[PDB]
Design a protein around this ligand. Sequence first.
Ligand code: BCB
Ligand code: BCB
Ligand code: BPB
Ligand code: BPB
Ligand code: MQ9
Ligand code: UQ9
Ligand code: UQ9
Ligand code: HEC
Ligand code: NS0
Ligand code: NS0
Ligand code: NS5
Ligand code: LDA
Ligand code: LDA
Ligand code: FE
Lengths: 55, 24, 273, 258, 55, 55, 323, 58, 58, 58, 58, 58, 58
Amino acid sequence: TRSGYVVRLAKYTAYSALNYDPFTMFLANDKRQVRVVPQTALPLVGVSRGKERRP
Amino acid sequence: SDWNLWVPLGILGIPTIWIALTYR
Amino acid sequence: ALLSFERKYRVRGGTLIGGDLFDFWVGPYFVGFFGVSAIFFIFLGVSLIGYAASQGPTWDPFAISINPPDLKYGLGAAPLLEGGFWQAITVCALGAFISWMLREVEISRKLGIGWHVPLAFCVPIFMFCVLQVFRPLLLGSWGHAFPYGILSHLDWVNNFGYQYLNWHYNPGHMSSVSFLFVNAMALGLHGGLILSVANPGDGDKVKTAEHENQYFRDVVGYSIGALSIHRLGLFLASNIFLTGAFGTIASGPFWTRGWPEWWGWWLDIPFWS
Amino acid sequence: MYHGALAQHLDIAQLVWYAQWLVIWTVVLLYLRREDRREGYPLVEPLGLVKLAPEDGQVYELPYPKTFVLPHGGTVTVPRRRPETRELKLAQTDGFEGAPLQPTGNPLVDAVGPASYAERAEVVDATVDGKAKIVPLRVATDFSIAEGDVDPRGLPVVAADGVEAGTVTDLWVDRSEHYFRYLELSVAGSARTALIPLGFCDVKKDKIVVTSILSEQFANVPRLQSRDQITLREEDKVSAYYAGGLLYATPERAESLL
Amino acid sequence: ADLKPSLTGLTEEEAKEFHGIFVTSTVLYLATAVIVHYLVWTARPWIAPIPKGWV
Amino acid sequence: ADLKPSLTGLTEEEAKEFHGIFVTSTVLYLATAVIVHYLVWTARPWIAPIPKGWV
Amino acid sequence: ADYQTIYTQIQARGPHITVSGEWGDNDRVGKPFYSYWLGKIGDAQIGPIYLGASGIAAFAFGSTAILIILFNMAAEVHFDPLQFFRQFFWLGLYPPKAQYGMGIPPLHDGGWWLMAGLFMTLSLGSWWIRVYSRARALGLGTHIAWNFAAAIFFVLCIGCIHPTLVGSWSEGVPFGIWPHIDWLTAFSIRYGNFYYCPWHGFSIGFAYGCGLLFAAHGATILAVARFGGDREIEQITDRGTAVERAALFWRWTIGFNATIESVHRWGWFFSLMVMVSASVGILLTGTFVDNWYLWCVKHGAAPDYPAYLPATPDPASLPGAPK
Amino acid sequence: ATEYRTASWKLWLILDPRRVLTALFVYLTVIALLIHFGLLSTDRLNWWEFQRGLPKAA
Amino acid sequence: ATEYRTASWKLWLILDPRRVLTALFVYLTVIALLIHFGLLSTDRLNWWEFQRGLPKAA
Amino acid sequence: ATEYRTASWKLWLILDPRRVLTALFVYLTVIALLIHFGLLSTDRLNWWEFQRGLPKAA
Amino acid sequence: ATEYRTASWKLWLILDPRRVLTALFVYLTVIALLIHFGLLSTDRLNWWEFQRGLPKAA
Amino acid sequence: ATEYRTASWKLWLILDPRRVLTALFVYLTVIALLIHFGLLSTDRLNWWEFQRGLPKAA
Amino acid sequence: ATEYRTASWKLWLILDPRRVLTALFVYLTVIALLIHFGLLSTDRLNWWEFQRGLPKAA
Ligand code: BCB
Ligand code: BCB
Ligand SMILES: C/C=C1/c2cc3[nH]c4c(c3C)C(=O)[C@H](C(=O)OC)c4c3nc(cc4[nH]c(cc(n2)[C@@H]1C)c(C(C)=O)c4C)[C@@H](C)[C@@H]3CCC(=O)OC/C=C(\C)CCC[C@H](C)CCC[C@@H](C)CCCC(C)C
Ligand SMILES: C/C=C1/c2cc3[nH]c4c(c3C)C(=O)[C@H](C(=O)OC)c4c3nc(cc4[nH]c(cc(n2)[C@@H]1C)c(C(C)=O)c4C)[C@@H](C)[C@@H]3CCC(=O)OC/C=C(\C)CCC[C@H](C)CCC[C@@H](C)CCCC(C)C
Ligand SMILES: CC(C)=CCC/C(C)=C/CC/C(C)=C\CC/C(C)=C/CC/C(C)=C/CC/C(C)=C\CC/C(C)=C/CC/C(C)=C/CC/C(C)=C/CC1=C(C)C(=O)c2ccccc2C1=O
Ligand SMILES: COC1=C(OC)C(=O)C(C/C=C(/C)CC/C=C(/C)CC/C=C(\C)CC/C=C(\C)CC/C=C(/C)CC/C=C(\C)CC/C=C(\C)CC/C=C(\C)CCC=C(C)C)=C(C)C1=O
Ligand SMILES: COC1=C(OC)C(=O)C(C/C=C(/C)CC/C=C(\C)CC/C=C(\C)CC/C=C(\C)CC/C=C(/C)CC/C=C(\C)CC/C=C(\C)CC/C=C(/C)CCC=C(C)C)=C(C)C1=O
Ligand code: HEC
Ligand SMILES: CC(C)=CCC/C(C)=C/C=C/C(C)=C/C=C/C(C)=C/C=C/C=C(C)/C=C/C=C(\C)CC/C=C(\C)CCCC(C)C
Ligand SMILES: CC(C)=CCC/C(C)=C/C=C/C(C)=C/C=C/C(C)=C/C=C/C=C(C)/C=C/C=C(\C)CC/C=C(\C)CCCC(C)C
Ligand SMILES: CC(C)=CCC/C(C)=C/C=C/C(C)=C/C=C/C(C)=C/C=C\C=C(C)\C=C\C=C(/C)CC/C=C(\C)CCCC(C)C
Ligand SMILES: CCCCCCCCCCCC[N+](C)(C)[O-]
Ligand SMILES: CCCCCCCCCCCC[N+](C)(C)[O-]
Ligand SMILES: [Fe+3]
């Protein structure tokens, strides 16, 4: 039942509307980094603009 | 190049003519 | 020390408690019994903060904090440095607030105006009481209340909210937030509209009440009307806390799951599930 | 190497912070607060010592004057010097700066404390057309009560005593707001109509209850100059009388609860 | 008030001159639409026959 | 009041002067469009024939 | 109680007078009707409405936007009508999920997002013009327009400007009830906690400020409504007992007062400032500060607390840690 | 009537061209947009794009 | 009544063509849309798309 | 009429140039934007950019 | 009353046909939808779809 | 009264048919809904579906 | 008309320069900006930067 996807997803993440399946992203394999927050006060030159940056 | 892809000419063209002709 | 028109209004009486002995103005301030009382708390409470902050680990104004006692102390008194002063201040606080509010009542009595102001001021007081007193009673510890500290207090707000997994979804919050926004927008419009009519630019004549009406009935097609906006303002403002108070009290005593899970009621009606 | 770094400890955010502050205070002080002193300033002194200048920093204080060009002719200049020359019937408790005052005679008639009015311009309030704004329903014949409400015309006006003061003659309407401002009642015992603000009476199904003043003092509600229109000053006069009664109707209204 | 625009009405004659054109032009449009639909059909025949599985 | 401009009608002539230009330029606009659509076709023949799989 | 401040007891009906504009007296639209219930809190009469060009346009773009939004939301539930209606708050139109920098993203990943964005932008503007023009049409001042302006600008900041300065559309707010909110958290997590950004501070200050101020102004007027203090404009030009009292009240309490006119300025100023403060913060973020907390620690503003349970060294940094 | 068979036309006495015209304009445009959009959201029947349909292929 | 059987027609004296016409117009459009979309939400009975139905196959 | 065939012109009596013009102007603007941007967010029929299409290539 | 047995009919002097008519119209419509859609959200009694009801089968 | 036994009827002089009618309409509808849906949310006592009950079965 | 062929000029009677003129100003400014910016968002057709285009080169 194709219409039910969103709900199938929500119930997995505590009923929030977040749109990612975190099993397949983080748990199935070691391919992603969980850490997203920068470890410095100011934007570090060379990783902080455009296609250098993460989404 | 439009080969039996008259389609847009059809849509664009047909009304263009009867617009010209109905309101005189 | 007086406004040009002030004198005719400065008459005796209309104190709630203890008559004539406190019925005087210091400068522009009217004192009264509650004046005195307020001051006393303010002075003591503030001093107490200072002393307490002195035996902290910093003096950065943002970084200073007076925290409440651990959860083990229950609803009892704690050692003075291990949460006691917190307790102290909280009372001086309440003290000050209430004395403030009553003073206002005395003032309004003296002027023969309505008591709307004091009462309106009662709403936030209540929310303070809700957060510092009731909710902690219901969970049975003072340690559930928030600490006094500019940045410190926010840390409390922050963690509290992540204790239910995403506070944004808590329906009390939703309502309160909506009001907060409407209120702000509405103040803007009310502000502007008066000002536009008064100061119409150039040597244009000041406009009439009808122009206020026309203006809105043009832009959005309805005009709430002049008195009622005032009335309505008061209403919006007030439900910021009135509705929120519900969401606040709920979290912990009446709900222990994440707030999103609560919308399950709708999401899960078995008909269309 | 970092974006937004002015030194090894100084960053553009940090500077902006102060900047922001600066503006706020400036606006507040060098503007808003000045705008606030358009009424009732400069400050007056009836005890203190040789002072033509408020809290200090402030005799600039007053902003330079505006000039409101009014809708139906004329100009007003703000701030002004509007002098109070009514001679107040108030004796002082002490000669002291901020010690309160005692009314000498009847405070409700001598118009002091909550019973004091402002000396407004002695003209009729007007519509955008040039008609009178506030009129009774004898005059505004086009206007009417909404179907579904109680017409208070005919009802008994009961005062603070529990005694019928008189009966309702009319309602008065604001023509430019579609709103009722006054009840005009017929004070029983005399041959007079007095005007009560609608904010001083709880209208019921059977009666109009007036907590403000006592039955006997309806006899002394300020008299209207004309019969069918009301000036701006007369409005203030009428309103102040009842409100003054909230402190002066009974002797106990003075006193504190204990 | 004893007329159709009875004693200075805000004005609309017995104009079915409008009705004429309205109906003409509405039909032209529906015709053109058919012609068009035919053409597109030849480019992308859209309904499809019932497949091997179905039912 | 028994006319088109019957006792100050609020200011529009019998102007088919406007009907004139309006219909003129409506055609030019559509004309130009056809031409232009043709040129583009030669640069990017957009609809495409049906692929080997399809149906 | 005094009932006359809470609701209206006796309602009035009669002929409403139209103020003739500078232009477009003609483009007022609809039969004005009454609502007796609404009449208990404000004017009962509900029509007409001005139309004119700006309107037309605003609606034009606005609707297109809405359409694109909804349509894509439908497409998320695969057009099942029942499910749509059940799942509606959880549905949204999202910006791009891959990193394309600032390139116009593919239709299926953020493309449609962008289009709706542009159209929403355009409606806002068209509307702005409406507000501003109408004012000028009726010989009023332009204050409302300018307040409204700031609001719009802040929308711009979080919509495209910020994305731009950091140079990725990925940072856009999504359309949809819940999902516009999920944005808030993500965004905050990413920039190292927004409670610690000073402009978030300012903003909130002013916002609560508005609360305080309206409650106060609101309450004040009602308290003096008995003297006809709700007639705010005549009070400006010819000061009556009403506002004399109102002033006195505040003076005797906090020790300084306003005027009937200037209180409006204060309110107008506070309102404005919410939006401005916000905009600044947004602009600074990502561009000059990467992690607001760490920044507050570099300037020692951040409070520090002792450990309750034992302090925990990050496992990543141990000898012989995995990845 | 000018050689009419039915009263049909009397509709315009009742209804108002202006409202009808303007409504149709909108109505049609919406339906039009919907259909267009819905088409360009498929995999058959998206012109404007390489056949991502993977028609049967794989 | 011009050669009539019932009074039915009197309804138009009570109800008002304009209301009815307009509302029908809307009502129908809705239902129409509901069905259309609803159908194109399935697997059997979607035209506009490849047979994703996987009718039984696998 | 100045040597016409139809009443067509009379529309401008009923309808109003100003509003028609102003509308059309917005309307066409909307559509033009839709088309341009929509196009430039494809892979075929993007001019402006290098052929990202990877038409079959790869 | 034209050979009527009851007074039933006087109801329309009390009630207002226009309200009744309009209410039923809506009322019914809704129930109808509930039933349709609700049915088509089961596994048995869904026409429109393949029997992914998998009735007992597997 | 036309051949009555009680005065029951006088109720309608007091109470108002239209209120009672409109209320009952609603009241019963709601109750009806509660029961219907309520039932169809069980395991026993759901028509409309395959026997989810697993009645004793496992 | 001062040696004119069309009535076209009458548009200014109907339309008002002040408005036309000003709106145009805005309009044009927007389109300008959209294009300029849009362009400098690409890789081909961005001046103001090195050829990030990596035109085929990597
Ligand atoms: C991660 C956690 C979050 C969170 C956690 C949260 C909690 C736990 C609570 C709220 C609450 C509220 N939140 Mg939320 N919040 C809100 C807005 C709001 C407010 C509408 C509302 C009430 C604020 C309050 O309690 O005042 C407090 C003000 C008080 C108590 C009055 C103090 C005034 C006092 C009487 C007088 C003081 C006088 C001074 C001492 C005098 C000193 C001055 C000088 C002159 C001497 C917005 C708009 C957002 C956005 C935009 O995201 C947001 C996000 C969040 N909130 C985050 C998601 N929020 C409250 C609420 O209502 O929840 C439903 C609340 O409990
Ligand atoms: C976990 C995340 C949090 C968070 C995340 C956050 C972010 C990221 C931002 C804020 C911002 C703000 N926060 Mg915060 N927040 C706030 C309150 C505020 C506001 C004062 C300010 C946002 C400006 C605003 O009013 O938006 C409402 C007003 C808006 C959106 C303007 C709308 C006007 C527009 C013209 C509307 C008209 C639209 C049209 C009708 C169009 C219709 C659409 C069609 C076309 C489809 C409170 C009171 C709290 C509490 C009590 O905790 C809190 C906590 C949090 N915030 C949590 C910590 N907040 C902003 C800010 O100030 O940052 C520095 C901001 O960017
Ligand atoms: C919905 C209803 C809204 C609303 C309504 C109204 N608001 C009013 C009134 C109305 C009607 C008044 O009539 C009254 C007033 O006079 O008009 C100016 C008032 C006032 N609202 C103030 C602050 C205010 N309003 C807030 C919120 C809303 N207002 C909501 C939004 C907030 C928020 C939201 O944070 C703040 C900070 C003061 C300026 C002023 C009272 C001074 C006082 O209370 O004197 C007495 C006390 C002092 C002067 C100092 C107290 C020192 C104590 C003893 C100990 C130190 C404090 C300790 C508790 C540490 C905490 C700090 C920590 C968090 C880091
Ligand atoms: C501190 C400063 C505050 C502030 C200030 C101010 N805020 C203002 C003004 C000022 C000064 C105005 O002057 C202006 C206005 O005029 O108000 C009277 C306005 C506004 N702020 C609105 C909403 C708002 N303010 C918010 C916030 C703050 N504001 C902040 C907090 C928020 C939040 C917080 O979310 C919200 C939601 C709107 C009322 C209004 C925009 C109208 C518009 O821009 O129109 C744009 C036009 C549309 C979206 C078209 C509508 C199309 C319809 C729905 C049909 C679509 C259906 C379609 C599928 C099919 C078509 C068929 C169809 C026939 C069916
Ligand atoms: C000289 C002499 C004899 C000396 C010896 C005597 C001696 C030493 C005696 C003993 C002293 C004693 C016993 C006592 C000391 C005095 C005393 C009682 C002090 C209390 C003082 C105290 C704690 C003061 C702090 C003031 C305070 C709490 C807050 C400051 C105000 C703040 C921050 C307000 C928020 C900002 C804000 C909303 C500003 C709004 C602007 C204004 C003015 C809003 C109010 C306002 C509104 C809202 C209107 O609607 C309005 C409508 C129409 C006209 C006017 C107004 C108006 O003014
Ligand atoms: C006079 O000059 C002026 C005018 O006239 C010329 C104007 O018209 C105007 C303004 C022009 C206008 C058109 C004004 C209209 C502008 C507006 C923003 C009006 C819009 C207001 C709303 C949409 C209402 C807000 C509703 C929301 C934000 C949604 C909230 C969502 C939920 C779920 C709320 C749930 C809870 C509730 C709805 C109510 C809860 C209430 C309680 C729990 C308790 C209630 C408390 C009371 C009743 C008070 C206590 C009772 C007494 C004290 C007697 C101005 C500015 C000007 O001043
Ligand atoms: C002459 O000098 C003085 C003045 O003039 C200068 C004064 O005005 C005043 C002021 C005195 C007044 C009564 C002012 C008028 C009264 C009011 C305005 C009402 C508001 C007053 C209050 C809310 C509290 C005042 C009463 C007290 C502080 C009594 C203290 C009671 C106790 C049990 C203290 C002993 C501590 C314990 C037994 C430990 C266990 C108790 C706790 C842990 C509670 C603390 C935690 C909380 C959340 C507090 C919440 C409870 C409350 C706020 C009542 C004083 C005291 C002074 O003498
Ligand atoms: C059971 C323990 C646990 C709980 C509960 C938990 N987290 Fe985490 N969280 C972690 C761990 C472990 C990591 C780091 C994982 C890694 O190194 O890959 C983490 C990482 C994070 C990060 C990334 C920090 C960074 O360095 O970029 C955020 C943000 C976060 N958590 C937020 C949350 C939120 C919000 C919740 C509650 C909803 C939550 N966490 C609940 C263990 C937990
Ligand atoms: C005297 C008078 C004033 C002067 C004359 C006035 C003049 C000249 C009038 C003539 C000029 C003009 C502009 C005439 C215009 C006539 C027009 C526009 C007729 C339009 C008819 C439009 C029709 C019939 C539209 C029917 C639309 C439908 C049936 C849509 C159905 C949609 C569905 C079933 C859902 C499908 C959705 C899906 C996703 C599959
Ligand atoms: C006042 C008078 C005296 C002076 C006279 C002065 C003059 C001559 C004024 C008139 C001169 C001018 C400027 C006339 C202009 C006439 C114009 C602009 C006519 C325009 C007609 C435009 C039409 C018919 C547009 C039809 C558009 C559509 C059908 C679009 C359909 C779009 C879709 C189906 C979806 C595409 C979107 C997608 C696939 C994402
Ligand atoms: C240079 C190039 C190529 C492009 C530039 C494009 C550009 C200007 C981008 C900037 C975009 C901006 C400003 C984006 C802003 C996005 C924002 C702020 C979104 C925020 C919130 C949206 C929310 C909460 C909306 C949710 C919407 C819905 C649930 C559906 C919409 C429907 C309604 C509101 C109801 C009305 C419909 C009813 C009549 C049937
Ligand atoms: C964080 C936002 C708060 C901004 C500060 C508000 C200004 C308060 C007004 C003080 C008035 C000073 N005074 C007594 C000279 O008038
Ligand atoms: C109200 C928001 C709190 C955050 C404000 C940050 C304060 C900076 C001033 C502290 C001095 C230290 N500094 C900046 C030189 O490093
Ligand atoms: Fe006001």
